[PDB]
Amino acid sequence: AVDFSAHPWKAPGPNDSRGPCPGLNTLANHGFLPRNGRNISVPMIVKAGFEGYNVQSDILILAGKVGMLTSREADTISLEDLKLHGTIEHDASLSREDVAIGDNLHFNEAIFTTLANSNPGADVYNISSAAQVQHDRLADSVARNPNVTNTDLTATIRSSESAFYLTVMSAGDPLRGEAPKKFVNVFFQEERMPIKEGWKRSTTPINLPLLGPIIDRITELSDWKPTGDNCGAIVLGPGL
């Protein structure tokens, strides 16, 4: 049985590995993944994402094995390894800076302002607000980053990530594609499960069939267009 009371939030120490992903960082901060953020396998991620968020193995195996490429080890990563630019890590993040013009690893409040201020007049973020934020964040990178990369692949990953915050931090059925701002804000700003605030793990499995139409709708509403190269080539390992 999973006992959330047995999984308290603790702030990471200075030598606990944390990465650019709030999903995995939050799992580590609650001990669903190792609190040190090290020696993490795809099986560990699969189990952690299921226990913490009811996210299913389909998306976690797919994403997990791509993430494994970022380390030099046979079958594990440190969470910090995931910052490797151009494997999964991309420009026009929701809460991090572009690597060419800043820190692509740590939560940045100034970047996060765009998301925080989205969906004015409501107490939830939803698909249309998520799309607007993606549009605005990409425009910011195009304006300010002379090395900006924007491809079909980065755009899809970005929509996947928005679909994650909308589903995993939902109050009701994750199908609805909306999440309380108070929950999503805690998730990004503190990398904590907002238990005190009333959040509970989804009782509905979050899998590719559920996420797919949400992802596609976020993309559609974001008014995304190709801007240049558009080759969806990933970096296959570190130090190439």
Ligand X SMILES: *[C@@H]1O[C@H](CO)[C@@H](O)[C@H](O)[C@H]1NC(C)=O
- Contact residues toward ligand HEM (CB under 6 A) are 20-24, 45, 49, 53, 55, 60, 63-64, 66-67, 82, 88-90, 93-96, 161, 164-165, 168
* Residue 160 in the binding site for Mg ion (CB under 5 A): no
Q: Binding to a copy of itself by residue 42, rule CB under 8 A? A: yes
Instruction: Kindly state the smallest distance separating residue 215's Cβ from a copy of itself, in Å.
Output: 13
Q: Which of 5, 54, 48, 22 is nearest to 190 (CA)?
A: 22
Which class for 183: exposed (0-12), middle (13-18), buried (19 or more C-beta within 10 A)?
A: buried
Q: Does 129 help bind ligand X (rule: CB under 6 A)?
A: yes
Phi then psi dihedrals of residue 126, to 5 deg: -145, -170
Residue of 4, 39, 80, 108 that binds ligand X (CB under 6 A): 39
Stretch that binds ligand X, among 88-96, 121-129, 160-168, 185-193 (CB under 6 A): 121-129
CB atoms inside a 10 Å sphere around CB 173: 13
Counted residue by residue, the chain has a size of 240
216 binds a copy of itself (CB under 8 A): no
Interface residues for ligand X in 100-119 (CB under 6 A)? Answer: 100, 119
Q: What number of other Cβ atoms are within 10 A of residue 187's Cβ?
A: 23
Least distance to ligand X from the beta carbon of 5, Å?
25
Coil, helix or strand at residue 66 = helix
